Amino acid sequence: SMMDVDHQIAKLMVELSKSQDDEIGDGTTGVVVLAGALLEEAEQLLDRGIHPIRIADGYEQAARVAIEHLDKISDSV
């Protein structure tokens, strides 16, 4: 929020972190690192010639898998 960005993708990342803060109030730095990493890997996938939408769909699928696995390994307090 304090960062003076002019790149619209940096603005999207600012909005992402603010969204994590609104919904949760923690994780505001993990979300940005994780999204950056996902795009960094999409970079190699696009280099190999995959359609960016296929990348987005594989990411959605894997995200569903990870969410259910979190529900699975979760603990209660």
Add this chain to the structure above:
Amino acid sequence: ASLSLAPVNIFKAGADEERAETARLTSFIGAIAIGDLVKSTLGPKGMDKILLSSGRDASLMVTNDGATILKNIGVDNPAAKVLVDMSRVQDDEVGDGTTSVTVLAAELLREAESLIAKKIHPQTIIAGWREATKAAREALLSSAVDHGSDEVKFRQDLMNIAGTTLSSKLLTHHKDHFTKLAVEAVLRLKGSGNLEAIHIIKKLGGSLADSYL
């Protein structure tokens, strides 16, 4: 990669982003500049500074008070701003120690620069500094002495503390005189801490020893 040294710049015209070594560089040089500024006013033989403001009035001040000196300077380094605010907070909490705290912070940051040069993480440094702060707090508390019970010994401690506070300042010329003043002025409050109660009228003329309570 990096935020600034990237093929695309991600910032508005006029912004900037100092990274790891450059950030510690600016921080340490600014803090150490502030500290080297405010020292030489430290101790009985400390000398004063001139605060020749450049405003349309060109206010002129001659001070040995670290809080005033730091308040009245145009700082642009953020770490220097941190130290400035720290001295202001010292002046608010108690009325002394603004130069001792400023010099101490600056020397700690100098030593931290040295340690970072030794290829040490500033987390191991902050951890060790917290441990050292604990040890120092206990040593201080253990060495502290209390004499508020004995009324005469308390009067002696009050006179000695007032003398030690005025020793560094321009009043060390007539320290004893002003020492008595300050002590009486604080004893006339009868336990109250209201310093707004103590009015000080500054009348031009006469010698500094003509001052009285």
Add this chain to the structure above:
Amino acid sequence: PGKEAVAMESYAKALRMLPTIIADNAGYDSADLVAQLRAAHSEGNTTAGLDMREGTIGDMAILGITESFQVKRQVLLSAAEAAEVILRVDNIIKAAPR
């Protein structure tokens, strides 16, 4: 054990550099006087301090050189705290000045 010992030693050096500067400002052998003081406080003379009239070491209890515990404790804690917060910084992102 470890590099935390080194950072503790640096903390100690800064604490020592405070009276060093106090002595420098008068024109005395800051190194000599702070060395004498360090040796005394290692010996157990917890009241050894600078006598700035003649430029020697003396008994603060006798000379009447005492400070408010409030003041010295606040000095220590605020200085260490500000140094901590300044040391945690690894990036300075400034915004376009107004």
Add this chain to the structure above:
Amino acid sequence: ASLSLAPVNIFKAGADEERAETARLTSFIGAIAIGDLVKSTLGPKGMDKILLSSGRDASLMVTNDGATILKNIGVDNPAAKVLVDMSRVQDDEVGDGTTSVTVLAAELLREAESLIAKKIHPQTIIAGWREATKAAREALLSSAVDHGSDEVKFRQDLMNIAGTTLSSKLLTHHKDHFTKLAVEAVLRLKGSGNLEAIHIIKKLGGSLADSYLDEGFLLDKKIGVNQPKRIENAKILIANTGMDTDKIKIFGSRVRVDSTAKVAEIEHAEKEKMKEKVERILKHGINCFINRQLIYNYPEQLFGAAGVMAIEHADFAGVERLALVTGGEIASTFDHPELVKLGSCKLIEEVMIGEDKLIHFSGVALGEACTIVLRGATQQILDEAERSLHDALCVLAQTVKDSRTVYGGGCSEMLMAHAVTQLANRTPGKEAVAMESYAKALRMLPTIIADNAGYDSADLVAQLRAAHSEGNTTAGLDMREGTIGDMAILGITESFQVKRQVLLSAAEAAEVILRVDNIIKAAPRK
């Protein structure tokens, strides 16, 4: 008062005068900037720099050489200029130590800044530094070892020194390979120190391991047109004659006649003069003729008809190297052939390197000259390989001159610091403090060597300091695993000349920079 901060300014518009503290400030920050710049190239694990000059050509270099780095930077601090000149002088004297002297001077000035902050006069510091330099010189000289007598042990020292010099450079990939080259290249000189004799040809393409040391000699010149291309049992005349419309040195001479017939007769006489010159040459009984100057069409034709290979436009360097490698005499007069010594080589052929043809002299007679063919993937790689080879060859020449060696890997610096410490703890006063700072800088050299690899510099320098205090005068850094070891066994040895020059030049430049209390700049021309 003061020169600048006086009610009246005494200077022309644009000049200035930095006083005591401001002068030492600029000096120390400039020198320490230079030093922190040139380090990180120090040691086996040192990394290269890019010299992206901003000129109209924008030359590009990738170097680990401290001398080149400092030469190729626009410096404006005068103390930095002093350190730059110091590194240049190191590069001139010997071929190594250009980064070590700079880092050492910078560390000495850092410690001197610390000491001046301690309220020490910058005279007492220099006094202690002179005493420490004396002690260090004696410790170094006493630890040095000489093996030039035993030929095999001397070969071992040469191989080890070349390896230590190339360890820091881009050739450490194929160190052993280039080590052999460098050693052979200096041994072909047979005691001579002429490094101009060692020619280095940089041919783009191929790997750096395709580089080799030609058993004979290579020349990047051309053979004539109708002249042979291969010659066995070649007898060679090396010359510096005209053979190019060679005119009688009488300059007022002019052909002034009344008939074109006489002009033609005089032209024919000129040609007959050139022919008689060629015949005097051929009376030496030769098959190859190399001229420093050009060879025009008519003498080319004559040499071709005579069956002689006439190589033209070799340079002063080409003819000197040919004289050294073949045994011939550079000649400009041919009226006493019995006095002109010819060069001999079993074979002169034409060879391909990359996409270029070169004259190859094999079976040469003397060999006191060399040709190194450097192959590489990029011109920057080639230039850095030439610089590294020059370093190694210069050091091996300096060792052949003076076989004194001193162990490296921080052993030498730690030893000198140990001697300075012994001197310091017995000395009274602030000179002891300045000696201790001298020792700290000496110790900060191996500290940096270790840092550049990524090891616990503090831990390793502590181990080394303890070893050199115990009496294990050969303890040094083993940078393969990152431990301490015996430099005598690991083969990490340096030229005593180089290390002594490092010490002395660094201490001397730091001394001259420390004597300064005022910097008076004049209005820049620009």
Add this chain to the structure above:
Amino acid sequence: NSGMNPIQTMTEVRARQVKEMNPALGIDCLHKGTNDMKQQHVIETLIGKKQQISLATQMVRMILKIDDIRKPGESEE
């Protein structure tokens, strides 16, 4: 950030997680010896992690789905 080698530490803790089924094995940032976060009392909220994953994936999707930009680009004041 804790000075450990990323690949080494991560591969070791991954191998341990696979062998001894234990999704409480992670990075000893404080160097307490143990890799068991359930013992170190290192605790995150399930909704926190799930929201991190969901937000990162959704925003990465919206970013990969963009293939054209048209800024003012005027460099105005």
Add this chain to the structure above:
Amino acid sequence: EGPLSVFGDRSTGETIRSQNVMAAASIANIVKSSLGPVGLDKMLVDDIGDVTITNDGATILKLLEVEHPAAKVLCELADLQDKEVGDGTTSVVIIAAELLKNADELVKQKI
């Protein structure tokens, strides 16, 4: 720009193909009106009042001041036809431009 850092502009893909076709088409439309017994002549004024009337396609494309390389190619084509044959300098330009047009249509279809 950006990652490359080349000090120049870069067109890539359908953009540059469309540009090339536009350039060739421009050159062909210059001369299309001068083809056949019903074609008409052209004036050309040389920025100084020097006038040239002509129906010769090679002449027209020589006098023009062309900057695009895909159009310089067609000018050189007309010049080459004028050197080697002496007639057909307009038809050759028109045909080259039309081949470019249809071929770019095919390349858009991802042939």
Add this chain to the structure above:
Amino acid sequence: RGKGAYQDRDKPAQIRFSNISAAKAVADAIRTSLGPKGMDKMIQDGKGDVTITNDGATILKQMQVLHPAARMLVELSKAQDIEAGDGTTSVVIIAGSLLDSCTKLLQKGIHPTIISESFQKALEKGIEILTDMSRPVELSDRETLLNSATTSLNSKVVSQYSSLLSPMSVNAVMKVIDPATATSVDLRDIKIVKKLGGTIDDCELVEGLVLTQKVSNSGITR
């Protein structure tokens, strides 16, 4: 023990990443001119000198690249043009790809020295592997020579004329070398004379001599 080396400086890593990014940008810029289905690039010099080409060395040398790593890739392609005269695009793409891989390696926290040495190991193993794959050939095997020339030409604008320029390109080399003793070829022995006009179907292999210098006599041409 506890923590390792802090790496108080980040500019080295920034420099490594900038070099890798520049190299990958060059590689991905010329990736399109690789193979029989690869296309050409037009390059208009500052003076306006146009150049259409499919050659990687020419492409990189002609575009005035400015980043140091990209300059080094230009020199690399030139070195391949010298040593082999074929592969000037594949070599740049390979370099860019190795550097783009060094990106993620560095990210993992590996030292550049380890990366370089491991790359040397992989290089030695790959030289071994390619040598194993190869088959020997006799220079008398004209079919292999024709096929090599055709493969070399498949990538270039002269590929519809390959049927014509492959036999010429093999005859030319086979006329300037003794096939029994030759260990190399000097292509300055092969003169190329570019004359405008006609089509690429008019290219010729003249065993004798060709000169652009004019004849001075009028009436004596043959």
Add this chain to the structure above:
Amino acid sequence: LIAGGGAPEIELALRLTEYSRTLSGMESYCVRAFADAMEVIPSTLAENAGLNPISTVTELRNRHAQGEKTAGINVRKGGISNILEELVVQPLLVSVSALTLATETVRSILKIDDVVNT
């Protein structure tokens, strides 16, 4: 002589992946990186040909694993095949020098840690 159509790059990628699996340590990761990096030339050939690079390169890896080391990208048929039937051959020196020079330049570039403006 070596086959073309990206066959040497694919064989190289595969066999160095195996070599990497044998070199357990941190050199293993770097050798696997070298392999996957060399796998980019076939991917590029496929992309430019107009095929699906991922599927094409996976088919190539699979067929080279079966043992047809002279298998490559037939842009005439549009897929994978024995490339010698299309007569796509190139000198071994080309591939060898490309590998050597690229590796040397990469090692040089990795030894750089600063840039100065002379």
